[PDB]
Structures are given as structure tokens and as C-alpha cells.
């Protein structure tokens, strides 16, 4: 068993000093420092607890070098809102518009009777 | 490193101005052609032998060739 040491000057087990074991071609065990785990974006609905699909889960500054398609899904509000909430929003908009139209026509009928 | 799997695009990258040298590795059961470009090293692996040494004269004349002994 080969006990192994750190490779940087940070000697504390902080959130940035996270390593993993690897076997080099020289037949030795060494530390490789790992990047922090990214998170997929959360839906803009504010209710759905899951995270969006089709988007890579990497750290924010890694988004600068990804392609456009890897960061979004080809749909209206895609890449920022979930499909279920998009459908609900669509239905809601259409139905409130219809409700307003019928209310206005009823008001016009009442005015005509008056 | 990048692996090239079909025959002709290897020559296509070989004839690029960027390419520096091609080295030929001859192990058992494989023949590897390694072309060194600016960004990547492109490796083309041939399983048989006859394709290898009928391609060995197909490289551009102005491109350095190094046989790994």
C-alpha cells in the first residue's frame, strides 16, 4: 500500500480540494483534482421540482464554450421552462383571452339592452 | 488524438499545409500511421499488411516520413 500526498499547497479538505485516485502509466497511484459537479437549470415555472432535460449539467463558466444546441431544447421557452408548464401557460393564455372576449360581448349586450 | 477510420480522409489531412510529419509504427497485427498536425495527432490503423505498404508510397513527397524502429 502506497500512502499518497497532495499535489497543491492547499492542505485542507475544503470544497475545492477534492481529488480522486488514478493509476498512471508509471504504475503509481496519484491524485487527480476533480471539478465540481454541475447542475442542470431549474424550470422557470417555480413549481416543478425537477430540472430541465436536454441541457448539459456543467458549471456556469463552461457554458461559454458549449454550442447553442447543447444549452437549449428547440421549443418555445425551451431551455428555461418545462414542457408541462409551457402547455399550461398556453392553455391559460388562450382561455383567459376567450373569457375576456365573452365578458366584453356580454357587456355590449347589456349596454344594448340598456 | 483523433482516430481516422476510413482510408481517404487520412490522405486528405496528410496533404494539409499544417501537417508536419508522419511516423509509421509497425507492431504485430496492426500498422499505425501517425500524422502530426498543429492541434491533434491523427492515427490511422490498418489491420492487414498489403494496404499498408501499398499506401506507404501514397503519401505526399514533401511530407517527412519516419519509420519507428
Amino acid at each position: 500500500v502506497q500512502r499518497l500526498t497532495y499535489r497543491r499547497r492547499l492542505s485542507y479538505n475544503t470544497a475545492s480540494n477534492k481529488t480522486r485516485l488514478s493509476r498512471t502509466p508509471g504504475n503509481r497511484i496519484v491524485y487527480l483534482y476533480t471539478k465540481k459537479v454541475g447542475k442542470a437549470p431549474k424550470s422557470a415555472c417555480g413549481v416543478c421540482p425537477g430540472r430541465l432535460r436536454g441541457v448539459r449539467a456543467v458549471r456556469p463558466k463552461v457554458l461559454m464554450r458549449l454550442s447553442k444546441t447543447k444549452k437549449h431544447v428547440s421549443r418555445a421557452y425551451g431551455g428555461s421552462m418545462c414542457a408541462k408548464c409551457v402547455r399550461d401557460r398556453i392553455k391559460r393564455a388562450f382561455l383567459i383571452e376567450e373569457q375576456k372576449i365573452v365578458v366584453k360581448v356580454l357587456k355590449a349586450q347589456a349596454q344594448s339592452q340598456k | 488524438p483523433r482516430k481516422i477510420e476510413e482510408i481517404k480522409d487520412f490522405l486528405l489531412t496528410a496533404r494539409r499545409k499544417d501537417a508536419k510529419s508522419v511516423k509509421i509504427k509497425k507492431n504485430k497485427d496492426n500498422v499505425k500511421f501517425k500524422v502530426r498536425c498543429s492541434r491533434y495527432l491523427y492515427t490511422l490503423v490498418i489491420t492487414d499488411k498489403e494496404k499498408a505498404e501499398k499506401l506507404k508510397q501514397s503519401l505526399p513527397p514533401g511530407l517527412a516520413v519516419k519509420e519507428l524502429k
Partner: protein, 135 residues
């Protein structure tokens, strides 16, 4: 009885074309073999014409008032019907379920749909169908 007829205006509910308005051109309330679910072939508009107005030249008017259309078969669960309808004629031979087996005549179907949508929109009738849904 059944209300979703081959002349209805439908708000498309899912897929890449979400929030668009389409017109049903052929409904099938009983699923066929390849599609057990009930469905319908519809023609919609992908790019609504821009908000045209006065005090601009008719070259700009023509450039803005141009439609991009799509033709697609949708499940009924992904289609929201409305109480509106448009009597725009679509050629059955050009626009049919057989259009999807190749990418050659699908372009023809989209061409015909786009042309018909433009010539109907220019008249000003069914103006609600040609304004995007703000959602």
C-alpha cells in the same frame, strides 16, 4: 357530437411548433394501424407576419407580410381546439398523409400552404388566425 372537423382552427400544444395556430386538413378519430391513437393532419404557420402599419412603403409591407408554414400530423392530446374556423381551401392531393414518406413533395405541400395562407391573409379576413398568441 364530434366537433373537431376538417375546417377547425387548433392551437398546437407541444413539439417544436408550440403556441402556433394551425388548421386541421384531415382528422382521423379512429387510429390507423401505424398510429393506434386518434390523430389529425394539420397545416399551421411557423413565422407569423410582422405587425404591418401605415407610413411604410409597400415594399416593406410585402417584406413583412410573409408567412412560413408547416405541415404535420399531431396526436389529439397535443392539440387544443378553438371555436374558430377558416374556410381556406387546401389541395388534398398535394397535402395528405403520404407527404411524409419523402422530403421532395413535403416542400411542395409547405409551398402551397404558405401561398394560400398569404393570399388569404392579404384580404384581412380571419385576422385573429394571423396574430401570434401571447403566452
Amino acid at each position: 357530437g364530434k366537433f373537431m372537423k376538417p375546417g377547425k382552427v387548433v392551437l398546437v400544444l407541444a413539439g417544436r411548433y408550440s403556441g402556433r395556430k394551425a388548421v386541421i386538413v384531415k382528422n382521423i378519430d379512429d387510429g390507423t394501424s401505424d398510429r393506434p391513437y386518434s390523430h389529425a393532419l394539420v397545416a399551421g404557420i411557423d413565422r407569423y407576419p410582422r405587425k404591418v402599419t401605415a407610413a411604410m412603403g409597400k415594399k416593406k409591407i410585402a417584406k413583412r407580410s410573409k408567412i412560413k408554414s408547416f405541415v404535420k400530423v399531431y396526436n389529439y392530446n397535443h392539440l387544443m381546439p378553438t371555436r374558430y374556423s377558416v374556410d381556406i381551401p387546401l389541395d388534398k392531393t398535394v397535402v395528405n398523409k403520404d407527404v411524409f414518406r419523402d422530403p421532395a413533395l413535403k416542400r411542395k405541400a409547405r409551398r402551397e400552404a404558405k401561398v394560400k395562407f398569404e393570399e388569404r391573409y392579404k384580404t384581412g379576413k380571419n385576422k385573429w388566425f394571423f396574430q401570434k398568441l401571447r403566452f
